Amino acid sequence: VRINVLRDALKSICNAQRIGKKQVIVRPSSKVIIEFLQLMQKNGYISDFAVVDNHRSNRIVVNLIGRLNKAGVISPRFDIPANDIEKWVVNLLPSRLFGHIILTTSQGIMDHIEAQHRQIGGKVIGYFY
Amino acid sequence: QLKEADVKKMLVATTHLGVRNIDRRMQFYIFDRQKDGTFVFNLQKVWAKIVFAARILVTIDDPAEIAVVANRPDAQRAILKFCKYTHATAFPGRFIPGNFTNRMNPNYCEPRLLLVNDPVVDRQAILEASYVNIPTISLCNSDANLKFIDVAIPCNNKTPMSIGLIYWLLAREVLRLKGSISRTEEWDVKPDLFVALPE
Amino acid sequence: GMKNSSGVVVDAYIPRKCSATNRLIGPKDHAAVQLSVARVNDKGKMIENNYVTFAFCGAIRSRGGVDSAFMLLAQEHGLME
Amino acid sequence: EEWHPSTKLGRLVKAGKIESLYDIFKYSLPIKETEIIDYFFPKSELAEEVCNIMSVQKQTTAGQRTRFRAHVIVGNRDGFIGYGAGVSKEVANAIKKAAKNARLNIVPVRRGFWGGKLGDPHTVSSKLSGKCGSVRVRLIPAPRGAGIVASPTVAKVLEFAGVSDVFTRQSGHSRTLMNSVGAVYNALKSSYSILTPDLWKKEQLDHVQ
Amino acid sequence: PVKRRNNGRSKYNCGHTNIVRCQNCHRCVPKDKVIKRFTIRNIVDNTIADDVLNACVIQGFAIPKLYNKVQYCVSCSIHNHIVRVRSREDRKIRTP
RNA sequence: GAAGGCCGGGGGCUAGAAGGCGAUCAGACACCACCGUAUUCCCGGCCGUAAACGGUGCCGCCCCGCGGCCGGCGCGCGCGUCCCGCCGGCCGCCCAGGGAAACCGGGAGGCUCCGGGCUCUGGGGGGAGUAUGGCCGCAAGGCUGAAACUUGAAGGCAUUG
RNA sequence: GCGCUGCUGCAGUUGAAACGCCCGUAGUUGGCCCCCCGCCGCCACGAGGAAACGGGAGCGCUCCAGGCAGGCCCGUUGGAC
Lengths: 129, 199, 81, 209, 96
Ligand SMILES: [Mg+2]
Ligand SMILES: [Mg+2]
Ligand SMILES: [Mg+2]
Ligand SMILES: [Mg+2]
Ligand SMILES: [Mg+2]
Ligand SMILES: [Mg+2]
Ligand SMILES: [Mg+2]
Ligand SMILES: [Mg+2]
Ligand SMILES: [Mg+2]
Ligand SMILES: [Zn+2]
Hints:
Shape of chain E: elongated
Number of strands of chain E: 4
Strand content of chain E: 15-25%
Radius of gyration of chain E: 20 Å
Bound molecules: magnesium ion, zinc ion
Distance between the termini of chain B: 38 Å
Strand order of the largest sheet of chain E: 1-2
Radius of gyration of chain B: 17 Å
Number of domains of chain B: 1
Order of helices and strands of chain B: HEEHEHEEHEEH
Largest sheet of chain E: 2 strands, antiparallel
Helix content of chain E: 10-25%
Structural class of chain E: alpha+beta
Oligomer: part of a larger assembly
Largest interface: C-D, 30 and 31 residues
Helix content of chain B: 25-40%
Number of strands of chain B: 7
């Protein structure tokens, strides 16, 4: 059965971007998907998107610009102590200069840079570069 | 802009008639299907494509760097006249593999643009061009595979008249764009030269 | 455009980007081509020697569809639209 | 006697029209003459090295026919590396063919910083992975002064390419030398083909060349 | 390794098929794996068909035919040249 | 839960383990020919194994192109069991991609750029699916399942002879 | 060393290895939706609680392994954390 909607959405996004398309459709929308896409947009990776209301698990349409290189999720959301982020950065990201790691905290969904700025920790959701 | 004379010439030339098969990458050029099943092209689309190809051709300053390849017996005459009037280079007959990668081949050249009449019959040269960063423009029928085909001209390419007519129109357009001739006066050359003659 | 600590670019060279897929073209991509299209005066029949340039990577060419991309790009850059 | 260009690019290089190798690489123009580089590399800035020499046999009606396969790498220690192989009935002729092939194929190497930026680049731009046969390689940027943590064979390639800090991991049958060298060569080759946020700048194309 | 994609038989959407007996050796073979040919022949060889027609008293008579379906096993077909061992590329050909 | 096998009753034509006999052979108690018991068939009940194979666990998402067949439904007209589609199923070829390769591409893809969920199995070759225990079964046997000792290779795909 | 015990991080068409198939309890995993209330997990901080070892501030046992010292006009000299 369907479990992780975000994983399906990200896989579809990468599949479409691989063959140089311009628009993708994701079926089951959700708040977490919307925040993930908002962060991606803010960092300049996927331009804009729209949500279509059908009264049943709204759909969503996104527009690409051939900048995204890889996106993914960590299924069992482990807890990241505020001082245990550099290990994950080294393990997951190509470099310490570019790339982002998404965490959910009591203060909301934020990039790992922001969490390092505020010296707090939380749970890991995904990553992209 | 398409004129009545041009459309009537194309219709008498049976240029808009294709084949029973269809490809998903050409459905945009298809306008209708006949009762038997033959597909019907769109004259405005092919005209716009011819104009675009003529522009691309005139972008090259030296006509000697353009290669015209055709293994079809019917095309030979049309390509020969096209190159003679445009002062380009022709590769009639069989295409020797290694003509573009083997520098020791007696007939070896470095073209900048390549022109083909049928990918199926001339696929050997298309790959060779793909090895050396050479764009290609080809004449594609209803069922064509556009692997490494930059520009596709939607036209018939089996009837002897259609082959000669398209080349004649292309030569006319390129010469006009070059400024040698004007649009209003009909070209002195008649299309019958490009069509192959029996016996 | 990898800047130094002083803002001085230290990249050897900036490679080209496909005009459709926005993808870097590698030094060894031998199926990568670049074309030009000529501009036409008001009277027609004449080129003004102003050309617009495009570049395409090998992957899109192999997969096809470069024709549709070229059509849309020309329409966006010209009156064909 | 004198070198007679057999190609348009060769003739242009004979003239002073082209002034640098990056002007060739940026258009993905193939190189077919060994002179196209030595004219750009006259001084002994580059260096050649023989990696491995293996003998291969072909059974026949009466005994075996033996031959030698050779592998050679070349680089200037400044963002340039090449790798080639050659086979011939004589060891020296195989070495010459391998050296010519290594010279023929060459790629630039992108170099970057680990964390802090200061001075010239010293390590690979990011993580680079390569594949050949069963062998996979990983190159992770390292801090300044960390040296090259790699096997003797791969370390020679890294030194020739001009990299002073890097962490390496090898997987698969690494005792097959040619496949490991090919994997590292491909990983290095991929460097100038990965898009980064610094390269997002949109530049208009130039009609000239 | 695997030599054929069909595994040497035409078996789709099923688990078992009825068996048949080879007409030369009487081996038991699956129906989908046996080599089958249909033949139509005159009861009388064409050499003496004219002679028989000359001798026949009936007017408007027609020579009757024989309709038989021959089934052979893999070993016997090769031995009797009903099928041949082909090259790797020719194995994909399905036309007579 | 194939076939064979067992228990208790029916039935008895073909074929045919065992057995007999004629040939072949140096030998032939085997291959070939002939006769022929159990069995092959039905009823009730045990056994619970097969190359029980697509040698590919189940649920779910995305995904090049061309084509054939089966079932159902809708559209169009010049009304043909025509052609344009949708869902489900069975197949063929195949660009990318993947792989040690053969090859797969309705995945064996989206994976060292290596995290969707659940269950089972494996850790060099023999000794050995053996010994000893336990459960099951009328039995034949099935499930579970070592150690000492020994050994430097055993295997897969492909190339030339 | 060994990503040959694999959470990070193995393999299961052909090399060793997907139960013959179905139902099914324990177990594990479970679409989307309400801005502010309660509880559980989670993150941060804090209190409380032996040192030695380990890290670490300062000091020229001639250096070092070490130790907690020394000169003078000493943070109340110091042995902080
Ligand atoms: Mg075999
Ligand atoms: Mg079966
Ligand atoms: Mg039975
Ligand atoms: Mg099995
Ligand atoms: Mg994995
Ligand atoms: Mg193992
Ligand atoms: Mg073992
Ligand atoms: Mg086996
Ligand atoms: Mg096995
Ligand atoms: Zn037979």
